[PDB]
């Protein structure tokens, strides 16, 4: 035996690895990149007007946003056809773009009594417990009346400053440029962006009927309570009419095959628990074989949930003069790509289970298996001092650099210091006593004394392993 | 060459697919006047593939030869621009020419390519290649002509030595790694 058992589980795994490769080949095409790039270089790179240089990426005031809304925005959405408006003469703008704002209410924080004669009013930072819900200005339409999240069919966004809800004051722009511009001018005249505003969303979607691939676009502008403007963007190439070409039928067949494979792998792994070895996990080849199954189950459930309800597309196709609410699908597509990309990584890592075909591949794995116990002990000691530097940098420089503004950024900056990437031209500006001292001590202690021990140990281990084999050859 | 979904067939009246040999145009368009509006096969054009950035374009297509001087060339390209010679179906455009530059003896062949992807936009790509016709000019050449013959003789000697060695050692000659690098 041992060739009808340790090889059958390899041939059944090679087919799995081929089906997974076929499934991950069809997800990422080559036109998707240019489709996103052309749209990205249309709203974020053109200057707001011919006489200025700023674009959406470098907005720095509430007047720049107004210049962008009437200007570089309307020049991209509406194109005179050689009535609908194809963007690049292929990208059909379906529906109408929608704009929305979220604002806080007056008198929302506490003014110290000492200087209350100067501070007339304040507006607190954004929070669900301090969000305005009352009409303001002329109470004509839906742009001056608080509409809840339930009847907006909205959802949270998790922006940069905070996490904004799906309610607020919204307005659906028109279908032709000459009246959308009038609506924007009316919004600008009767001041719609007061100081109490905290967020603004502009969103739409396009089709590009040549290939079969939608594209939803959302642009966010955040106004922190400490003044300023922070822009953000998101372009997502959805696809909702999949079953058209024969290749789509082939992909459907290959994914039913994947479902069958995951069923087989879950049953033949349950069979090895109670009908066989009980409660032995510390092998790293069964702890990994469970992660793949769980991730695949999650990714299958997400995929079924995503394509089980496309009713928003049907509603839009019923009447094509409204706003297509494609925001939900664009989120689950990202959440599904984030899972289907991690499963492939672990499936590829699983190939190490079968590379022992000669007497020189066995010791190269024995070395790692015998130095993975000693490296783990030193890793904790390394990463404790790593975090000790990270938190000190966060507390000292994390106010005037922006390379240490948040703790994660502090960690990534040190990882980039290890690569020798960042230059310390501005570190000393935030502080001079601890400016160059921090850099020098960090480099010295973690690039000449602590980063080596990871090498030495490994080297030593390798040596003994070789002996621990060579002597065994001398015995025979 | 495209399949609109039935759901929104009324809104899109036509779509053009991504370039592919199985989905190329072969019919005249616009004023069917001359060679710029009639499909010509690759054989009749003496062309070949290119392997551009988006795909691999064939050698056929709709072509036009310009004039020898500026005036008629400008008039002819303006006549092309007056009509619509670059419709929505156009997928690639090639411009080819060659120059001599007699001042220093060095030819040059120039090919420019513009690709219009099926998602709108323009992708340019150029290629210059200088050629030379220096054979037996000054008194420095003959040296290279003799060196070429010497090199050919050396290769003949090396191959005959290699065949002798491989005849003596009928096999196991393909493991020293100093024989693979010699063949
Ligand atoms: C905001 O409230 C403060 C205090 O009530 C006062 O300045 C005024 O009522 C409001 N100011 C506005 C709406 O500009
Ligand atoms: C409110 O009335 C119309 C729309 O109902 C609007 O155009 C007008 O500007 C508003 N009136 C004002 C702001 O006084
Ligand atoms: C939310 O969805 C319902 C479902 O029909 C729709 O009637 C309503 O108009 C949507 N909300 C908005 C603000 O369009
Ligand atoms: C493209 O072909 C379709 C198929 O009938 C036709 O309806 C449409 O008018 C054509 N468009 C052009 C520009 O010829
Ligand atoms: C077609 O060519 C003739 C001469 O070859 C020219 O007189 C005529 O104007 C051309 N057609 C058009 C539409 O220009
Ligand atoms: C292709 O080569 C033939 C052979 O000389 C020539 O007659 C023909 O004109 C060439 N094609 C073109 C488009 O010039």
UniProtKB/Swiss-Prot annotation, chain B:
Phosphorylated. Phosphorylation is important for protein function; a mutant that lacks the N-terminal phosphorylation sites cannot complement a zebrafish pkd2-deficient mutant. PKD-mediated phosphorylation at the C-terminus regulates its function in the release of Ca(2+) stores from the endoplasmic reticulum. N-glycosylated. The four subunits in a tetramer probably differ in the extent of glycosylation; simultaneous glycosylation of all experimentally validated sites would probably create steric hindrance. Homotetramer. Component of the heterotetrameric polycystin channel complex with PKD1; the tetramer contains one PKD1 chain and three PKD2 chains. Isoform 1 interacts with PKD1 while isoform 3 does not. Interacts with PKD1L1; probably forms a Ca(2+) channel. Interacts with CD2AP. Interacts with HAX1. Interacts with NEK8. Part of a complex containing AKAP5, ADCY5, ADCY6 and PDE4C. Interacts (via C-terminus) with TRPV4 (via C-terminus). Residues 161-176 are cytoplasmic. Belongs to the polycystin family. Detected in fetal and adult kidney. Detected at the thick ascending limb of the loop of Henle, at distal tubules, including the distal convoluted tubule and cortical collecting tubules, with weak staining of the collecting duct. Detected on placenta syncytiotrophoblasts (at protein level). Strongly expressed in ovary, fetal and adult kidney, testis, and small intestine. Not detected in peripheral leukocytes. Disulfide bonds join 2-15. Residues 1-139 are extracellular. Forms a nonselective cation channel. Can function as a homotetrameric ion channel or can form heteromer with PKD1. Displays distinct function depending on its subcellular localization and regulation by its binding partners. In primary cilium functions as a cation channel, with a preference for monovalent cations over divalent cations that allows K(+), Na(+) and Ca(2+) influx, with low selectivity for Ca(2+). Involved in fluid-flow mechanosensation by the primary cilium in renal epithelium. In the endoplasmic reticulum, likely functions as a K(+) channel to facilitate Ca(2+) release. Glycans are attached at residues 33, 46. It is found in: Cell projection, Cilium membrane; Endoplasmic reticulum membrane; Cell membrane; Basolateral cell membrane. This is Polycystin-2.
